[PDB]
């Protein structure tokens, strides 16, 4: 239906400010229920709903919740964030599934609406939480290396200018060719832990949201 | 448990020859059966099973002799070696019904090779391996950042090589200063089963999954 599987796929990485879990997070603004997306290879921690199941978990998952489905379709509709402004968002870590509640709050009453994140619908998960995989390989591992080759071509420009009569004058503009091979050598031992760290979504949502949009588009 | 799974994460990715699907497999056959954690990126083989399943597969496939489960897993750790390029443990490309497709008589009389098989689950796309994958993304992106600032600094160096350079120009080719805006634009827009994933991340995974 593409508003919970395709548009959810076209949702940049943005770790919602949970209270307990540091796992991957982002919620999609829909008129057919809030949509999480957590791709981590083989234990789905995903939270996906339609109007019917959000209606059900409104009428039975909370002791006091008279908010109809339209109430939560509006709350999500009156929501612009895969993040949390504090619709109060909180996490009660009862399972590895990302407990991602969107409270009955619309800048006013913090009306009760709590979550036990179910194993979401696999149709909207396996279709577009594995797209990360091949899209990510085929996009990232080629474009990053092509940018490294752009470095290599500019360094070839430096070196052929220098040997052609553009010799170095100062240390500021003294930069001989730098390659990606030694770069990977030094990075995998020095800057790998700095740049292999999912964390709480601090670097996961700035170098990787647009990267992952390129991933899903590819 | 821990050391099997940790060394398995340290075990390099193995592409078992199947030619039907893509097998991103981790093999560490030391104890607790054959810990051949295969993952076709769409259905994981949680094949860390102990030696009991190894014996079950040995006996289900030897119809008048036996293969010792310890020896079975040992020489399967020797049989998977002529497979990462025999008894090719081929498996179907189906992402939800996963059965080993070794369909050939090694005897003249019927015989097959088969491992214990598991199917797809609604919960199989958010456990471990996109954390090292997404760490590879962060590694390549920070490498991009360093390469890019070096691009910009080196291009400002090149501007000095415009006023202080003497390269022969036939006028059939012109080299412009390395731009930055169009550079980022091409990095985003212009330049951009499971086989591509596995042959793209055979080396980068182990080199990044250490974290």
């Amino acid at each position: 239906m593409e508003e919970l599987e395709q548009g959810l796929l076209m949702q940049p990485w943005a770790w919602l400010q949970l209270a307990e879990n540091s796992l991957l997070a982002k919620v999609f603004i829909t008129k057919q229920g809030y949509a999480l997306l957590v791709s981590d290879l083989q234990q789905v921690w995903h939270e996906q709903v339609d109007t019917s199941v959000v209606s059900q978990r409104a009428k039975e998952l909370n002791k006091r919740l008279t908010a109809p489905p339209a109430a939560f379709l509006c709350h999500l509709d009156n929501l612009l964030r895969p993040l949390l402004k504090d619709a109060t968002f909180s996490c009660d870590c009862v399972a590895d599934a990302l407990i991602l509640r969107v409270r009955s709050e619309l800048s006013g009453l913090p009306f009760y609406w709590n979550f036990h994140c179910m194993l979401a619908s696999p149709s909207l998960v396996s279709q577009h939480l594995i797209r990360p995989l091949m899209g990510m390989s085929l996009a990232l591992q080629c474009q990053v290396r092509e940018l490294a080759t752009l470095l290599h071509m500019k360094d070839l420009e430096i070196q052929d200018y220098q040997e052609s009569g553009a010799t170095l004058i100062r240390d500021r503009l003294k930069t001989e060719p730098f390659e990606e091979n030694s770069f990977l050598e030094q990075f995998m031992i020095e800057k790998l832990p700095e740049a292999c760290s999912i964390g709480d979504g601090k670097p996961f949502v700035m170098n990787l949201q647009d990267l992952y949009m390129a991933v899903t588009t590819q | 448990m821990e050391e099997l799974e940790q060394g398995l994460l340290m075990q390099p990715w193995a592409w078992l020859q199947l030619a039907e699907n893509s097998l991103l497999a981790k093999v560490f056959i030391t104890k607790q059966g054959y810990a051949l954690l295969v993952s076709d990126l769409q259905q994981v083989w949680h094949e860390q099973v102990d030696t009991s399943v190894v014996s079950q597969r040995a006996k289900e496939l030897n119809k008048r002799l036996t293969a010792p489960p310890a020896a079975f897993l040992c020489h399967l750790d020797n049989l998977l070696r002529p497979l990462l390029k025999e008894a090719t443990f081929s498996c179907d490309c189906v992402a939800d019904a996963l059965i080993l497709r070794v369909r050939s008589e090694l005897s003249g009389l019927p015989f097959y090779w088969n491992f214990h098989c598991m199917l797809a689950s609604p919960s199989l796309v958010s456990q471990h391996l996109i954390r090292p994958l997404m760490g590879m993304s962060l590694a390549l992106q920070c490498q991009v950042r360093e390469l890019a600032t070096l691009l910009h600094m080196k291009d400002l160096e090149i501007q000095d090589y415009q006023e202080s350079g003497a390269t022969l120009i036939r006028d059939r080719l012109k080299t412009e200063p390395f731009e930055e805006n169009s550079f980022l634009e091409q990095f985003m827009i212009e330049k951009l089963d499971g086989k591509p994933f596995v042959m793209n991340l055979q080396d980068l995974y182990m080199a990044v999954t250490t974290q």
Binding site: - | N62, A67, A71, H75, L106
Partner: protein, 96 residues
């Protein structure tokens, strides 16, 4: 029969190797690349031959031998066969 697939899960050979295994077990000496035990269970009138490969030993097919006495006549036949084939080979030698 059927004694072929017993190694198929064991060392994962290919089919038809049992034919050559049997032929070279029958011919003088053991297999050039296959280990065999050469003996005889007079108690049970049974023969067996081995097959080991890839870091584990295993048990190839076997002869369900049948006891037929009077070794004298069969030995006479065998030695007559020997003498006759020597004679024909010598005739080929001299003709060549």
């Amino acid at each position: 029969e059927s004694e072929i697939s017993q190694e198929a899960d064991d060392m994962a050979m290919e089919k038809g190797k049992y034919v050559g295994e049997l032929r070279k077990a029958l011919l003088s000496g053991a297999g050039p690349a296959d280990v065999y035990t050469f003996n005889f269970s007079k108690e049970s009138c049974y023969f067996f031959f081995e097959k080991n490969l890839k870091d584990v030993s295993f048990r190839l097919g076997s002869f369900n031998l049948e006891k037929v006495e009077n070794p004298a006549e069969v030995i006479r036949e065998l030695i007559c066969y020997c003498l006759d084939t020597i004679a024909e080979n010598q005739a080929k030698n001299e003709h060549l």
